[PDB]
Amino acid sequence: GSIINYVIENYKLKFITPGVIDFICTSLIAVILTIKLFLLINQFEKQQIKKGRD
Amino acid sequence: AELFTNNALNLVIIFGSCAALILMSFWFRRGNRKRKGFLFHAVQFLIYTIIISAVGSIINYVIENYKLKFITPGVIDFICTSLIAVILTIKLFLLINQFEKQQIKKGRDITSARIMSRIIKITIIVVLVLLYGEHFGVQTASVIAVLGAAGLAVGLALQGSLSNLAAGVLLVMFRPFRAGEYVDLGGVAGTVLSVQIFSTTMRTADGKIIVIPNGKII
Amino acid sequence: ITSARIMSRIIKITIIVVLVLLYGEHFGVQTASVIAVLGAAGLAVGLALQGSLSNLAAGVLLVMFRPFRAGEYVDLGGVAGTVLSVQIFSTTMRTADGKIIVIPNGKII
Ligand SMILES: CCCCCCCCCCCC
Ligand SMILES: CCCCCCCCCCCC
Ligand SMILES: CCCCCCCCCCCC
Ligand SMILES: CCCCCCCCCCCC
Ligand SMILES: CCCCCCCCCCCC
Ligand SMILES: CCCCCCCCCCCC
């Protein structure tokens, strides 16, 4: 993502602004954090139900 | 001339943002396959704000371009963020009012639901000033200290209810007793009818209902 | 008149205190020692108002969750009687003897 950021530092011709890319790059990874982190909690709940908990 | 070379990306989202609203807006008109809730409303507000940011700031850049117009950059930025804040209040008040209507329908008393709505209105307004304390009006060190003192006072007042909530969570997780089990919770004995968030209801052998806060039980 | 006069004075004092907060820097001066002393005063006031805030929260809870309603015989910790009304800070019950008892909501909760 920052490789493309540097690619842009290079070809400034593209109207693409550095700020948006940095905002998107870190924003995208955050989303994966939620989706990835929610799965484990849901998986943990499934095991808890299996163990015998109400 | 030499300014459209930077607006191209901005116009891309503007057109996409404008089309995004139509797709989601017409979906609500055409029934509701997914749960309505407040998630869709937040997206609507979240998509609407981008248009203001995209095109409000699009016009901001338009001005960075034609400085001829006496229009000053500061006012536009103040108006752009100020306008979106107003939509936040109008949009956010509707859901709370809608929630109150459902509560009345469910069976809750008018005063029971009316009091609940007022509590949300006061808390929502307090949060709104926090998010726009600097932009709107002013926020000084004395103001911050007084607001922190008020928050501390509120937190100290709500100590009992939070303690009861924590005790109820613990009683739900660890089960020293269950609904239908004779128990003696500190001088009171009776069949347990139900464990709730703040208190549990037991029916003594005599036949009377007793409600005990969860914190005292724990 | 004294009931309303006292209420007006309380608003005057609080409104003035807020006015200096909003113009402490522009008008006069606002130093770090001044900020610390004002924060200490606010903390003292908040600690003093702990009981009233607790009663308010308890009353809100009693209004939301209804362990009892106006006209229901109850026993709120050693006192029993028909419940006449639940208010913000306290509720009024009338014992079977015929006397009125007022109990703070926090103690009830
Ligand atoms: C440079 C920013 C200074 C902010 C000062 C905040 C002071 C908060 C005092 C809180 C007292 C309870
Ligand atoms: C009706 C009362 C609503 C709650 C008001 C709380 C005020 C706290 C002031 C603390 C000052 C340090
Ligand atoms: C000073 C404000 C403190 C507010 C604390 C709120 C805690 C809410 C816990 C969840 C309740 C269901
Ligand atoms: C309002 C606070 C709710 C959470 C209370 C603490 C629960 C901790 C459980 C720990 C189990 C190992
Ligand atoms: C640069 C701003 C410094 C502000 C310092 C505030 C100190 C507050 C102390 C509060 C003690 C209770
Ligand atoms: C002065 C404080 C008023 C609010 C008291 C807390 C009410 C929490 C209700 C939570 C219901 C789930």
Numbering used by the authors:
A (entry chain C): 58 to 111
B (entry chain B): 3 to 220
C (entry chain A): 112 to 220
Sentences reproduced from the published study:
To further investigate this hypothesis, we explored a chimeric construct comprising the sensing module of YnaI and the conductivity module of MscS. As the splitting point, we defined Gly139 of YnaI, or Gly90 of MscS, respectively. The structure of the chimera purified under condition I+ and analysed by cryo-EM represents a closed state that shows the MscS-derived conductivity module unchanged. The YnaI sensor paddles of the chimera have still the same structure as observed for WT-YnaI but are slightly shifted and tilted as a rigid body compared to it. As a result, the innermost paddle helix TM2 aligns with that of WT-MscS. The helical backbones of the pore helices are highly similar in the chimera, YnaI, and MscS. Noteworthy, the densities in the pockets of the closed and open chimera maps are only poorly resolved. As the pocket architecture entailing lipid coordination involves the paddle helices and the helices TM3a and TM3b, the pockets in the chimera are built by helices of both donor channels. The chimera showed that two modules derived from different channels resulted in a functional phenotype, with the gating threshold inherited from the sensor paddle donor, YnaI. The conductance is significantly higher than that of YnaI and similar to the pore donor, MscS.
To prevent cell lysis, bacteria have mechanosensitive channels that are gated in response to the elevated membrane tension and release solutes, restoring the turgor within the cells. One of the medium-sized paralogues is called YnaI, with 5 TM helices. Structural studies have shown that the main difference between YnaI and MscS are extended sensor paddles, which create a periplasmic indentation in YnaI, and much smaller portals in the vestibule that provide the cytoplasmic access to the pore. The TM paddles are in contact with the surrounding membrane and are therefore responsible for sensing the membrane tension, while the vestibule with the pore formed by the TM3 helices conveys conductivity and selectivity.
